[PDB]
Write an enzyme that holds these catalytic residues in place. Structure first.
Site: not given
Ligand SMILES: Nc1nn(-c2cccc(-c3ccc4cc[nH]c4c3)c2)cc1-c1ccc2c(c1)CCNC2=O
Ligand SMILES: [Mg+2]
Length: 290
Positions: A24, A94, A140
Site C-alpha cells: 500500500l 487503516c 514532511d
Molecule cells: N494507515 C494507512 N493506511 N493506508 C492504506 C492505504 C490504502 C489502502 C489501505 C488498506 C485497504 C484495505 C485493507 C484491508 C486490510 N488492510 C487494508 C489496508 C490502507 C495507508 C496508510 C499509510 C501509512 C503510513 C504512511 C502512509 C500511508 C503514506 C506514506 N508514509 C507513511 O508513513
C-alpha cells in the site's frame, strides 16, 4: 496531562495478524502493507522499518502524536525478525480514502469551494498545532502524507509519516518548515497548482511574476492572500506561527467562510500529467528548508 509510554511487543506479529504481500505504499523509509487482525478480521496497515536509531525516533515521536484526531493512530508496535532483518513493525489504523488531492481531483462536479478549502486547512492546522505544542516538527507535511480514513464524503483527514520528525527544544525555527507546507497546500487547494517556478500544457505561473494569477485568483480576497503570504514568508524569523494561523478568522470561523467556487478541481484534472513533478518539486524544496 499524563500519557502512557510506548510498549513494544516482541511476539511474532503473525500470531496476531494475517500479513499479505500487497504494498500500500513505498513511504519515506519503509513500505506499507495490507493486514488483518486474525481474531477480529478488522483491517489495518503495517509500516515496516528496519530497526535503527532513526526508526526508533520515528516510532517514538509518532507514538506521542498518535492520539490526535488528525494524525494516523498507532495500534501497536512489534519488534520482530522479518526476512532475515530486524524490524519495527507498526500497526496503524487503516486509511482507505485516498490522498487529499486525488479526492479533489476526482470531484464529479468540479464543485470545490473556498469554504471547503478552509475546513481542510483547519484539519491540517490542528495536527501541526498538536505537534508544535509538544515541541515536535513534522517536517514532511505534503500531499502524499495526507490521507482520508474512508471513501465516505464524511471521512476524516489524517497526517502520516514521522520519518523526518524531530524534537525542537532550543531550536524553535525547526517548526517554520511545517508552516511553509501549510502555505503551499493552502495555495494548491485554492487554485490547483503550487506557487512554484520552472510542454503541451498551460503555464500557471510565469517565472518571477506576481504570485496570484488573475484567471484563478481573481475572486479570492486580499485577506486570504495575506494569510498565504504570511505562511510563505521567505525568512523563517518572520513566517506565520501555528498559533497565529489557528487564530486567523479564516481558519477559526471556517464554516462561515464564503462558498466561492474554485478552479481547483478542474485545474487538477487538466494538469494531471504534471502532478508527479509537483510532488517532486515539493519534496526537493522541503529537503532544503527543513
Ligand atoms: N494507515 C494507512 N493506511 N493506508 C492504506 C492505504 C490504502 C489502502 C489501505 C488498506 C485497504 C484495505 C485493507 C484491508 C486490510 N488492510 C487494508 C489496508 C490502507 C495507508 C496508510 C499509510 C501509512 C503510513 C504512511 C502512509 C500511508 C503514506 C506514506 N508514509 C507513511 O508513513
Ligand atoms: Mg490519531
Amino acid at each position: 496531562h499524563v500519557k502512557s509510554g510506548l510498549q513494544i511487543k516482541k511476539n511474532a506479529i503473525i500470531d496476531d495478524y494475517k500479513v499479505t504481500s500487497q504494498v500500500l505504499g513505498l513511504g519515506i523509509n519503509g513500505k506499507v502493507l495490507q493486514i488483518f487482525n486474525k481474531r477480529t478480521q478488522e483491517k489495518f496497515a503495517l509500516k515496516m522499518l528496519q530497526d535503527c536509531p532513526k526508526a526508533r525516533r520515528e516510532v517514538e515521536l509518532h507514538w506521542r502524536a498518535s492520539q490526535c484526531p488528525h494524525i494516523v493512530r498507532i495500534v501497536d508496535v512489534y519488534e520482530n525478525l522479518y526476512a532475515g532483518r530486524k524490524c519495527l513493525l507498526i500497526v496503524m489504523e487503516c486509511l482507505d480514502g485516498g490522498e487529499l488531492f486525488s479526492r479533489i481531483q476526482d470531484r464529479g462536479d468540479q464543485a470545490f469551494t473556498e469554504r471547503e478549502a478552509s475546513e481542510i486547512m483547519k484539519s491540517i492546522g490542528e495536527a501541526i498545532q498538536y505537534l508544535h505544542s509538544i515541541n515536535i516538527a513534522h517536517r514532511d507535511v505534503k500531499p502524499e502524507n495526507l490521507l482520508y480514513t474512508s471513501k465516505r464524503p464524511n471521512a476524516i483527514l489524517k497526517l502520516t509519516d514521522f520519518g523526518f520528525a524531530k524534537e525542537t527544544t532550543g531550536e524553535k525555527y525547526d517548526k517554520s518548515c511545517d508552516m511553509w507546507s501549510l502555505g503551499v497546500i493552502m495555495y494548491i487547494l485554492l487554485c490547483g497548482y503550487p506557487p512554484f517556478y520552472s510542454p503541451g500544457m498551460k503555464t500557471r505561473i510565469r517565472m518571477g511574476q506576481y504570485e496570484f494569477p488573475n484567471p484563478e485568483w481573481s475572486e479570492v480576497s486580499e485577506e486570504v492572500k495575506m494569510l498565504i503570504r504570511n505562511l510563505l514568508k521567505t525568512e523563517p524569523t518572520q513566517r506565520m506561527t501555528i498559533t497565529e494561523f489557528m487564530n486567523h478568522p479564516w481558519i477559526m470561523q471556517s464554516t462561515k467562510v464564503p462558498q466561492t467556487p474554485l478552479h481547483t478541481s478542474r485545474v487538477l484534472k487538466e494538469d494531471k500529467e504534471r502532478w508527479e513533478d509537483v510532488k517532486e518539486e515539493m519534496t526537493s524544496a522541503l529537503a532544503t528548508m527543513r
